[PDB]
């Protein structure tokens, strides 16, 4: 049921180091399950939840990958490649 | 004051891989302290809070142990042995 979860927003295509990057996840059509957000790149992220919202901050510029996985399977289009600009 | 915390619910006796398993924790009689929920078994869990609720998902079938610890002491009946069925 990972194909039923979708995500979108500016934080899945660009960010800026030190500036929260945001996107939403659409949950209405999805079943129940575990939802994991990971960021992988040249530095560590803080990632918060808040359909749901996700905000994340990385501290260094570089190319990052954001995955959204539902019961350990990539949703459509995950992983997202996000270039992160210098602050 | 760990003996004053109690927990119960279907998620302390069975689960299904990929399906959120749920139980509640009764906090009314308890003091203030740190409350930790751990799941230990053949795969990793996502565990959320939501008296309080706990929902967790594991991805593989097998025997798991769920502990609820208050200031690092098992509450009554913790650890809970939970067989997890295939999805």
């Amino acid at each position: 049921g990972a194909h039923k979860v979708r995500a979108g927003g500016p934080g899945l295509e660009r960010a800026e180091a030190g500036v929260p990057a945001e996107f939403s996840i659409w949950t209405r059509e999805a079943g129940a399950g575990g939802l994991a957000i990971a960021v992988e790149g040249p530095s560590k992220a803080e990632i918060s939840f808040e359909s749901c919202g996700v905000a994340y901050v990385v501290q260094e510029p570089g190319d990052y990958e954001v995955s959204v996985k539902f019961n350990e399977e990539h949703i459509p289009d995950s992983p997202f490649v996000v270039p992160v600009a210098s602050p | 004051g760990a003996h004053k915390v109690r927990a119960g619910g279907p998620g302390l006796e069975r689960a299904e891989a990929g399906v959120p398993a749920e139980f509640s924790i009764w906090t009314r009689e308890a003091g203030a302290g740190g409350l930790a929920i751990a799941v230990e078994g053949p795969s990793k869990a996502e565990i959320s809070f939501e008296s309080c609720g706990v929902a967790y998902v594991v991805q593989e079938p097998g025997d798991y142990e769920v502990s609820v610890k208050f200031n690092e002491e098992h509450i009554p009946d913790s650890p809970f042995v939970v067989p997890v069925a295939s999805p």
Partner: peptide, 11 residues
Amino acid sequence: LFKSATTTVMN
């Protein structure tokens, strides 16, 4: 190669 992750349960 750093990984950070956060997790929730969807009901």
